[PDB]
Design a protein around this nucleic acid. Structure first.
Ligand SMILES: [Mg+2]
Lengths: 57, 117, 252, 234
RNA sequence: GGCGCCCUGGAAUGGGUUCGCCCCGAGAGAGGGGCCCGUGCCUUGGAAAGCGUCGCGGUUCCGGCGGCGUCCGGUGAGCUCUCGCUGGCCCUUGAAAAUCCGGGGGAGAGGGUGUAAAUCUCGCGCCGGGCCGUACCCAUAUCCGCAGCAGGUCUCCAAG
RNA sequence: CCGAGGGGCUCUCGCUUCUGGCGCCAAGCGCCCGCCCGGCCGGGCGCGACCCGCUCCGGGGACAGUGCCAGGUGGGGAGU
């Protein structure tokens, strides 16, 4: 609808029950969840592979 | 002290209250436009007369500085009657015409009788 | 007695530029502690198009180091970038295409566009579509390097002039003919009010120093001194030679 | 104990947002601030003439506190005690008609225009002179003049402080004419400590130029070139 | 009507589709679902009013009184309007802002129970919405051209 | 440099680079009052986030500029 009529509706007709409800497209939510997961873990991998490098040089 | 911003914005200083020690006009001027000066005279043409019995509305001609809240109390306090709604108009002789509709508790054809027409 | 077309363009009434639908002044980000001492990670969001410019622009967002905010810059889009590319900016940025890093750190013979002509200027030299500048011959004491501008004029500049690596996107733009008068109307509709250029011979002696006569001729020599007054500088201004070219330039 | 954890913030480039640090140098001042600060620099950078440079050589605070202790009981008359002083003269004249009740009320004078009259008549015995006169030509002649009439002078720090002696704001000079003879021995105590420092040194304090030191960011690169010249030789 | 939305599953002997294209292992075809627009139809409004027609009252106010009707279908490169899908063009990329909304965060807040708190963008209910314009012409006669001047003057609607 | 557990003629800095993600409004430590009779709440300060200093940081710099005068040039313009 128009912008000012969004004041008349209720927030059941304006978003979706996911996180990032009426903002994101649900398939980049699916990718933002995987993108945050797979690269917070590799900064644990790159931390510990660096951490065993001072101790065995 | 530390200055966490590179902006030096000027301090909020104290602003006193204007409490003067003599009035500048010595007396509140009176309202020239009161509830008599609002409503000059009623309009008694043929079209206004058949809007009295047909529509429960009586018609005046009102001073042009008067809005509809001022009219609605001015007919209520002069003529001791309830007013439903008011519709104004500037008729091109230059004076404001007001179409005062009454509440259905009252009648227009006898309130017009006690004001003369 | 009447003033001429070349004089009226400085008054700026109907000759002001058409700056409505442009997307902004495309300038590199202002330098601070991050670009003096490290690198900053910025991701290019989009590739946009200024009307009246033939280089495309690229808008990059950067995580703001001082307030929790993101803020958006506009760079001249160096060629070969794509959206969703991380663009690194600072002294210790790694020498890749599209990254921007001071000319004292990149080695000689690299290819640079949009370089600052003085440190902090947010990018002035070699900006138009297809151009590039080459760095040569650093000087580590009295820190100052020279470059090779798109006119072939080599110019010694400061060593900390920040500059984006690569050549400007939109190259080859002048290879296609305009090919008709109507597409030259649309070319200059977006830029200025300069396109239909009436020959000064074709007009009356009030309006140009060459016009008049019963034959369309110049009459007087067309090459003028440089201290000629305003309204007499028409024609070939302060020419070192004329005629069809022999060689390339052969004079510094 | 159960759950609480350290979770520090990396504050290098490209990590967590920098905290609210001091920034009291890098802050855009008003143009009355940096006008007020750049001339304190610019008295230190120009070649200051020795006539202006008589100042910046003031008293040390141990002497200056002894001096204000001496000048404290020679305080001038205020309008509060001027009311009663004209009473006590008039109630006793109404009762006894004293031919001379007080032979010597002593006091210190105030004012440049009054002091200059005392020094060139040699009536003053010690001339306290201020430091921070805003048109410094109001005072610049007076150290050169107390040498010639031989009156001892001392530059004190701060024209606000000797202004409070005379119940005013700034008073730029005071003078000592008639001290009490029982307390001459405190005025004579520090007067050789003073005309050691000002009057006897006049051949040298008139020669001493001022200012002309480069800023610390530019004298540091002077030293770094000299250490490179020092590393060249050895 | 549309979906560049989802699930199962995996396609070459390639297939599916358009007027044109286009589409598919980054998931075709096929099967089942989901949201969006729903200006179309039914329903509430709503038959009481509107009109058509027949008939009888009332000097007069009469938004009189009553009978019956206001029904089925078809077709289209039709015309106008509108919504959508898809392309083409450009050294042409085809406005700003107020306003309104959704999300990310989680400082805080709330009654403490076999009782009810903070809060509520749900369903009702209550009061108010001032001021200025509003007639008429819009022109071979209400405008401008000295005039009821073959001139000039911006648009929307449109049948056989 | 030499060399013995080590010193420093000399130094470099360092804490973010496979990916269209996130990031602020302190965790933690040390202390101190009102608070519990060697225990519990309610607040504040410091470190974390180094100290000092004369320009905000750069680039120019006694030139450029500007003021007055002097000489060139001057149908750009004026008058005839
Ligand atoms: Mg031409």
């Amino acid at each position: 609808v128009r912008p000012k009529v969004l004041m008349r509706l209720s927030k059941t007709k304006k978003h979706v029950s996911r996180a990032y409800g009426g903002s994101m497209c649900a398939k980049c939510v699916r990718d933002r969840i995987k993108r945050a997961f797979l690269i917070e873990e590799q900064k644990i991998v790159v931390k510990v592979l660096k951490a065993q490098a001072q101790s065995q040089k | 002290k530390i200055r966490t911003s590179p902006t030096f914005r000027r301090p909020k200083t104290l602003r006193l209250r204007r409490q003067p020690k003599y009035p500048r006009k010595s007396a509140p001027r009176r309202n020239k436009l009161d509830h008599y000066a609002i409503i000059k005279f009623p309009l008694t043409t043929e079209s206004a007369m058949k809007k009295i019995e047909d529509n429960n509305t009586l018609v005046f001609i009102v001073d042009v500085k008067a809005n509809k809240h001022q009219i609605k109390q001015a007919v209520k306090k002069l003529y001791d009657i309830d007013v439903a709604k008011v519709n104004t108009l500037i008729r091109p002789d230059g004076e404001k015409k007001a179409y005062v509709r009454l509440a259905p508790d009252y009648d227009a054809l006898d309130v017009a009788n006690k004001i003369g027409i | 007695g009447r003033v001429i077309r070349g004089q009226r363009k400085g008054a700026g009434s109907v000759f002001r530029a058409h700056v409505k639908h442009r997307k902004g002044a495309a300038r590199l980000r202002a330098v601070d502690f991050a670009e003096r001492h490290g690198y900053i990670k910025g991701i290019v969001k989009d590739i946009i198009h200024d009307p009246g410019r033939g280089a495309p622009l690229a808008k990059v967002v950067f995580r703001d180091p001082y307030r929790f905010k993101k803020r958006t810059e506009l760079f001249i889009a160096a060629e070969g970038i794509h959206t969703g590319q991380f663009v690194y900016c600072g002294k210790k940025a790694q020498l890749n295409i599209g990254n921007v890093l001071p000319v004292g750190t990149m080695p000689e013979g690299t290819i640079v566009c949009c370089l600052e002509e003085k440190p902090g200027d947010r990018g002035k030299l070699a900006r138009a579509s297809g151009n590039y500048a080459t760095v040569i011959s650093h000087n580590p004491e009295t820190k100052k390097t020279r470059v090779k501008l798109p006119s072939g004029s080599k110019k010694v500049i400061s060593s900390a002039n920040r500059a984006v690596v690569g050549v400007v996107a939109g190259g080859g733009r002048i290879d296609k003919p305009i090919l008709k008068a109507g597409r030259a109307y649309h070319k200059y509709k977006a830029k200025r009010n300069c396109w239909p250029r009436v020959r000064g011979v074709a007009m009356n002696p009030v309006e140009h120093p060459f016009g008049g006569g019963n034959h369309q001729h110049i009459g007087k020599p067309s090459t003028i001194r440089r201290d000629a007054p305003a309204g007499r500088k028409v024609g070939l201004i302060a020419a070192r030679r004329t005629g069809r070219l022999r060689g390339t330039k052969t004079v510094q | 104990n159960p759950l609480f954890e350290k979770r520090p913030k990396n504050f290098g480039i490209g990590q967590d947002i920098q905290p609210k640090r001091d920034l009291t140098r890098f802050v855009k001042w008003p143009r009355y601030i940096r006008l007020q600060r750049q001339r304190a620099i610019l008295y230190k950078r120009l070649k200051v003439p020795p006539a202006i440079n008589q100042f910046t050589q003031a008293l040390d605070r141990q002497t200056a506190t002894q001096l204000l202790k001496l000048a404290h009981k020679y305080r001038p008359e205020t309008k509060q005690e001027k009311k009663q002083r004209l009473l006590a003269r008039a109630e006793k004249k109404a009762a006894g008609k004293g031919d001379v009740p007080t032979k010597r009320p002593p006091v210190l004078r105030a004012g440049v225009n009054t002091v200059t009259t005392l020094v060139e008549n040699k009536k003053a015995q010690l001339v306290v002179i201020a430091h921070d006169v805003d048109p410094i030509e109001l005072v610049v002649f007076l150290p050169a003049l107390c040498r010639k009439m031989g009156v001892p002078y001392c530059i004190i720090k701060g024209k606000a402080r000797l202004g409070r002696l005379v119940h005013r704001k700034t008073c730029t000079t005071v003078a000592f004419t008639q001290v009490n003879s029982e307390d001459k021995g405190a005025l004579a105590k520090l007067v050789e400590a003073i005309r050691t420092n000002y009057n006897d040194r006049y051949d040298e304090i008139r020669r001493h130029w001022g200012g002309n030191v480069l800023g610390p960011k530019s004298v540091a690169r002077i030293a770094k070139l000299e250490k490179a010249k020092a590393k060249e030789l050895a």
